[PDB]
């Protein structure tokens, strides 16, 4: 195992860092001319409608992210195999081998179908 106090220290780390971070924002807030005007708040690019109103943006990002969730699940499965490998001997490996094929097939599947979509 490993001591728990180290994990506690991790939290304290954030407590300090975040605090200085927030402090920075405060400094940035106080030192400023603060001359609000309509044109300064404008989104972008000369008068109105930088992008405007259109139909939904591409779901390709959804495709990539779903891919990522499944394969990160794969990686999270592979780590416990990564640590304890020798003690399990070839038998253990065999499982993950077949296992890999499964998700590899998935990948190979999406490769042979492709995403122009």
């Amino acid at each position: 195992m490993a001591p728990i106090q180290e994990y506690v220290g991790t939290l304290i780390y954030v407590g300090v860092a975040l605090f200085i971070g927030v402090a920075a924002l405060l400094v940035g807030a106080l030192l400023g001319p603060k001359k609000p005007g309509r044109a300064k708040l404008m989104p972008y690019e000369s008068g109105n409608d930088p992008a405007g109103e259109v139909k939904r943006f591409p779901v390709h990002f959804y495709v990539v992210a779903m891919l990522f969730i499944l394969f990160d699940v794969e990686v999270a499965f592979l780590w416990p195999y990564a640590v304890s490998a020798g003690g399990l001997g070839l038998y253990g490996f065999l499982g993950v081998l077949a296992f890999t094929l499964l998700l590899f097939v998935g990948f190979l599947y999406e490769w042979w179908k492709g995403v122009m979509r």
């Binding site: 005007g37 044109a39 404008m42 972008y44 000369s46």
Partner: peptide, 12 residues
């Protein structure tokens, strides 16, 4: 007017 806004679209 483009230059007008871009000057206005700067920090003060």
């Amino acid at each position: 007017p483009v230059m007008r806004r871009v000057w206005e679209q700067m920090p003060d």
